[PDB]
Scaffold this active site. Structure first.
Site, PDB file in Angstrom:
ATOM      1  CG  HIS A  40      -0.383   0.081   2.577  1.00  0.00           C
ATOM      2  ND1 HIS A  40      -0.165  -0.785   3.533  1.00  0.00           N
ATOM      3  CD2 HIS A  40       0.066   1.308   3.021  1.00  0.00           C
ATOM      4  CE1 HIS A  40       0.396  -0.170   4.532  1.00  0.00           C
ATOM      5  NE2 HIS A  40       0.529   1.090   4.213  1.00  0.00           N
ATOM      6  CD  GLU A  52      17.697  11.125   4.820  1.00  0.00           C
ATOM      7  OE1 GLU A  52      16.980  11.585   3.963  1.00  0.00           O
ATOM      8  OE2 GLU A  52      18.404  11.734   5.600  1.00  0.00           O
ATOM      9  CB  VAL A  57      18.986  18.223   8.702  1.00  0.00           C
ATOM     10  CG1 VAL A  57      20.500  18.692   8.702  1.00  0.00           C
ATOM     11  CG2 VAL A  57      18.076  19.243   9.385  1.00  0.00           C
ATOM     12  CD  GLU A  62      21.729  12.853   4.652  1.00  0.00           C
ATOM     13  OE1 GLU A  62      22.943  12.929   4.603  1.00  0.00           O
ATOM     14  OE2 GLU A  62      20.978  13.571   5.302  1.00  0.00           O
ATOM     15  CG  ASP A  84       0.626  -4.237   2.687  1.00  0.00           C
ATOM     16  OD1 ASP A  84       0.590  -3.674   1.601  1.00  0.00           O
ATOM     17  OD2 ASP A  84       0.718  -3.712   3.792  1.00  0.00           O
ATOM     18  N   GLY A 175       3.157   6.383   9.002  1.00  0.00           N
ATOM     19  CA  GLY A 175       4.462   6.989   8.645  1.00  0.00           C
ATOM     20  C   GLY A 175       5.452   5.815   8.811  1.00  0.00           C
ATOM     21  CB  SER A 177       2.850   1.891   6.203  1.00  0.00           C
ATOM     22  OG  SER A 177       1.856   2.281   7.182  1.00  0.00           O
ATOM     23  N   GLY A 178       5.415  -0.187   5.731  1.00  0.00           N
ATOM     24  CA  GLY A 178       6.582  -0.474   4.819  1.00  0.00           C
ATOM     25  C   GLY A 178       7.858  -0.739   5.506  1.00  0.00           C
TER      26      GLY A 178
END
Ligand SMILES: *[O-]C1=C(C2=[C][C]=[C][C]=[C]2)[C]=[C][C]=C1C1=NC2=[C]C(C([N])=[N+])=[C][C]=C2[N]1
Ligand SMILES: [Ca+2]
Length: 223
Positions: A40, A52, A57, A62, A84, A175, A177-178
């Site tokens: 999703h 990160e 910032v 990164e 999922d 925030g 999810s995944g």
């Protein structure tokens, strides 16, 4: 993450932020050119941001790479969130080092009781919206199947597991999810859903990665 703690810069080097002008999901680096996230969290215009900690910032370490393609599991059901999982291929490979490393896929599923680390830049309030700048962590266990199914009757399939605390207080939230659920150094889950965040008797549900290893392996092998 609600009730968690600050991971500490780059202590979870396999964690990625999926960005489309802002952070909208997290994901996991499993090799130099592939990330695993949740279905999703699919969209076009995904930039994968690696190394990160503060996502607002640029601190150094990164690497920002664009996705070359995202593969949603073909049997993903958006109404049940069964299957999922999603694989994102990167345009170029990431430079792995001690701050950007991958995580190994499991060889066996985890047992209830197993303690795991869940991380992410998601909401930290159960009642309200507060998004952090740096990464948060939460150590939570996998619950038995009977408690899960007793919390979410009729909504848990064999490709899902519950992990968390039934007393409430700690949980992954929007925030997150995944993102990853790593147990004993193996990726056993992906944050998928939950009813509210940190609510009592409503633990978080995670996609069961041990059930997709041949699929991840074969798909990556053919793309
Ligand atoms: O993941 C999510 C989303 C979302 C939808 C589409 C794309 C990306 C994200 C929208 C709202 C909420 C959530 C979400 N809620 C939630 C709750 C838990 C929990 N309580 N354990 C975990 C993960 C999520 N994501
Ligand atoms: Ca940053």
């Amino acid at each position: 993450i609600v009730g968690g703690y600050t991971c500490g810069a780059n202590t979870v080097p396999y964690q990625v932020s999926l960005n489309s002008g802002y952070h909208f999901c997290g994901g996991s680096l499993i090799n130099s050119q592939w990330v695993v996230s949740a279905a999703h969290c699919y969209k076009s215009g995904i930039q994968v941001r690696l190394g990160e900690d503060n996502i607002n910032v640029v601190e150094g370490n990164e690497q920002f790479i664009s996705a070359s393609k995202s593969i949603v599991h073909p049997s993903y059901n958006s109404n049940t969130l069964n299957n999922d999982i999603m694989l994102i291929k990167l345009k170029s490979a990431a430079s792995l080092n001690s701050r950007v490393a991958s995580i190994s896929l499991p060889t066996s599923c985890a047992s209830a009781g197993t303690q795991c680390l869940i991380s992410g830049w998601g909401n930290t309030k159960s009642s309200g919206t507060s998004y952090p700048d740096v990464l948060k962590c939460l150590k939570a266990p996998i619950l038995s199947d009977s408690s899960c199914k007793s919390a979410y009757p009729g909504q848990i399939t064999s490709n899902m597991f519950c992990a968390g605390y039934l007393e409430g207080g700690k949980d992954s939230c929007q925030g997150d999810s995944g993102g990853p659920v790593v147990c004993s150094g193996k990726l056993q889950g992906i944050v998928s859903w939950g009813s509210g965040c940190a609510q009592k008797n409503k633990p978080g549900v995670y996609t069961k990665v041990c059930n997709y290893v041949s699929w991840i392996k074969q798909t990556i092998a053919s793309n």
